[PDB]
Design a binder for this molecule. Structure first.
Ligand SMILES: N=C1NCCN1Cc1ccc(Cl)nc1
Ligand SMILES: N=C1NCCN1Cc1ccc(Cl)nc1
Ligand SMILES: N=C1NCCN1Cc1ccc(Cl)nc1
Ligand SMILES: N=C1NCCN1Cc1ccc(Cl)nc1
Ligand SMILES: N=C1NCCN1Cc1ccc(Cl)nc1
Lengths: 206, 206, 206, 207, 206
């Protein structure tokens, strides 16, 4: 019957932040889905935008699992104590600005959830943001160094209200958001890398 | 018959900065109260504002208690040596800029007070800022990863003037500040999360 | 017979950065003095100014003391290895940008001197900066978490022109500088906190 | 039998981040090539540009090798656990802003690949950015403190599409990219320092 | 029988980053000379300029020496493993932005060379920048906490074209560069602190 202190202590002794938790020779299945919170500074002339979004990220890591028969079955853990997938947005033109406490939730079964609220600038198509149809800014996110056999990424099944969390005070409104998985091979490299492309159709209010 | 050195040393020997100090299976009660110091940048067109405030924060941690019968009963402690609630402002569009030494005040019975002065940018209703009625900007703050059964937040009904510490050189002025407590279940997640909503009614001086 | 290496090693092992060096039941006496170096960007519309100054800060930590009858008398020491008063500028609207190496000077008797050059933005009265009488910007600095019985702050003065180190290439000039001492009691807390208030009377150069 | 945990621990135990892995008495051969992702800011008046690019960097460190017969032959390693060349862009006017996770790939034979995506501002020729032949911005990269007898740098034959990774949404477009090596002796210092000069020929597009 | 790993190993044992390496009771002789790379943001209205420059800095530290009879006689070392003089630019209005890897070069005889390329903004005389005689910007650099008896700073009057490294794409050009050594006694303190003043004569092109 251990408490949270013991659950945290066993996580640091067994957890290897630098070691991807693959099972045998299977890829670590990572789920990525964005929940837009705000659109702050659009520029149609430069095709750049400033977005704020929650980056819901989940994966399994057995090396963390613990017996919660008679103890807390879930805890908040600092990401520096866990292996976290090395995701990056291909068309982001600034480092992600993590606005929230960098803590993830870890379940006794090893399921991990990490959902930081991020503000980041992207290079995308802003043409038409000032029309009825609007603009569609696509954002691609995938593992930076782990190819398809080590990390697989797919859009979460969840499909909440596109703007269920979006700021009603933004100068913009979300028309629609679609997610689409991809598996690409680049000439630079022999292996294929997976990514999830999120298409944000939005327009200036009026 | 200890001194401040021993008090600090002991705290390092029992404090678990990454372990939420829950008593029994009950939530840690955190009190949040904002004292506005300044309103630096307001943009009605973008509905964005820059505010400086003291975030009076209190909670209890019995793992820090000590016998002060023959020693001081209070000491300043760097927050990095203590567990601190993972609070985040939901509508913040910038990371908080802590303008003061990051030290908390710990009392012998375990009571902790951390009151950092913060400059942060928010996304809120700025409409009417130039009218006599002014604008009403709501700031939502709560635990980012600890649900209602782990952390509960409540407003500090402290009796004092809202503009008691507000700068007299700001281009704006405070008309009224109210603080209400909320509890919300989001579609993203199973448990409920609490937050304190602080409503700042202010306007440009005449 | 000891060298600097011995002295600096001893200082690191005995000095406790998180323990205020109070002696007996009396407060640590801290002296503070500002020597203005520049005025970079003033804004009368927003009552905001950007200043560069040397903050001469001194205090005692007798535990650091050592017999220098047969070894160095003084040594430069990184402030992170020393306890330093948690001073804060109450009306500052940006964090201090320390321009100089963060080293303090420790004399064998335990006297500590720290004089960083700092650029910082403040919210103060800028009205009249374009007039012959100029504006008077007041800066308030004092311990953030240590009350009057743990830390004391007092203004230091030098028999030297207020503009002796001021930039001749600045668009502004110094008319006068005065420093008063205060002991304010805030409704937030029971004890009183001291502060040094420095008044800067400056104006745009003809 | 070895797993990733064994390898990463061994790498971190044998790798010397502050010791250039020169073999015998030859210099470490570092390969550098840039893959342009975007051109964000251009000022023909000041001759300053803001670019985003993948700085592909490869070199060998034999001590990192391990028998991959019964184990993985490739792993991602944080660069803080490895010695990496102290490359610097001579004409850069801002610290490089690394946009991606700072991880390198280490192969069982000791081959290392580090390819960060970087946004950085440079001082180069921007004249003609609105012409048909565009401007040609030269970026010079080489080791900051290791001379030619310690580190050598060569351009990788990027015989691929120059705009393969370039953003289709940039206000600019790439016409051509060439790379050439140089070995320079400055009057400041007795030894020669090698570098790779990347020539970016680009221009503003038309409506 | 020794290699680079051995050399670095010995250095990170005998070397004390916090201890100035004085010989006997004499001061550490430090050579400082700036190689201008670019002039970027000139403002004649505010007497401010953004300059990029290699800050060649040399000095000796015998505690680093080693027998190079059968081993390399030079190695690149992170400055965090070495004592480095605490130089500061008096009229700089921003912290130094070090653009290059922070490595110093150490020779077997204990000679050290540290030459980072720095971008920094200064407050200096910009008047005349648009004339033929041009503006003359004076930059002052010296130890911050080490007085004449601990550190002396002298310029390296080497015949190196003032524009060898200067960017041919700058909007400005270097007419001439001169150096001058000084020794000052600031009202704040008894000792005298040496500095080198580098006068930069430049002008707009054409
Ligand atoms: N994520 C991708 N897809 C193609 C290239 N790349 C980036 C990448 C791959 C491997 C290393 Cl060590 N560094 C960066
Ligand atoms: N504080 C809240 N309320 C709804 C979502 N959320 C943020 C959150 C919750 C759990 C984790 Cl691991 N990360 C971020
Ligand atoms: N010194 C000041 N200024 C405003 C309030 N206060 C006192 C204070 C007391 C305790 C803690 Cl943790 N922080 C600040
Ligand atoms: N890469 C080059 N070429 C000439 C000068 N230089 C930079 C350099 C060389 C040595 C040290 Cl310790 N610091 C900086
Ligand atoms: N070099 C300078 N410039 C202004 C004052 N000073 C000398 C000095 C002496 C002691 C300490 Cl702790 N700091 C600085």
């Amino acid at each position: 019957a251990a408490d949270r202190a013991d659950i945290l202590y066993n996580i640091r002794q067994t957890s290897r932040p630098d070691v991807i938790p693959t099972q045998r020779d299977r890829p670590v299945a990572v789920s990525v889905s964005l929940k837009f919170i705000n659109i702050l500074e659009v520029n149609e002339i430069t095709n750049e935008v400033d977005v704020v979004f929650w980056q819901r990220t989940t994966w399994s890591d057995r090396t963390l699992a613990w017996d919660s028969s008679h103890s807390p079955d879930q805890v908040s853990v600092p990401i520096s104590s866990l292996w976290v997938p090395d995701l990056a947005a291909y068309n982001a033109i600034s480092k992600p600005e993590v606005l929230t406490p960098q803590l993830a939730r870890v379940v006794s079964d090893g399921e991990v959830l990490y959902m930081p609220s991020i503000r980041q600038r992207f290079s995308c198509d802003v043409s038409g943001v000032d029309t009825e149809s609007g603009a569609t800014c696509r954002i691609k996110i995938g593992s930076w160094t782990h190819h398809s056999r080590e990390i697989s990424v797919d859009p979460t099944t969840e499909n909440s209200d596109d703007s269920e969390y979006f700021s009603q005070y933004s100068r913009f409104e979300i028309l629609d958001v679609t997610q689409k998985k991809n598996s690409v091979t680049y000439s630079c490299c022999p292996e294929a890398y997976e990514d999830v492309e999120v298409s944000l159709n939005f327009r200036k209010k009026g």
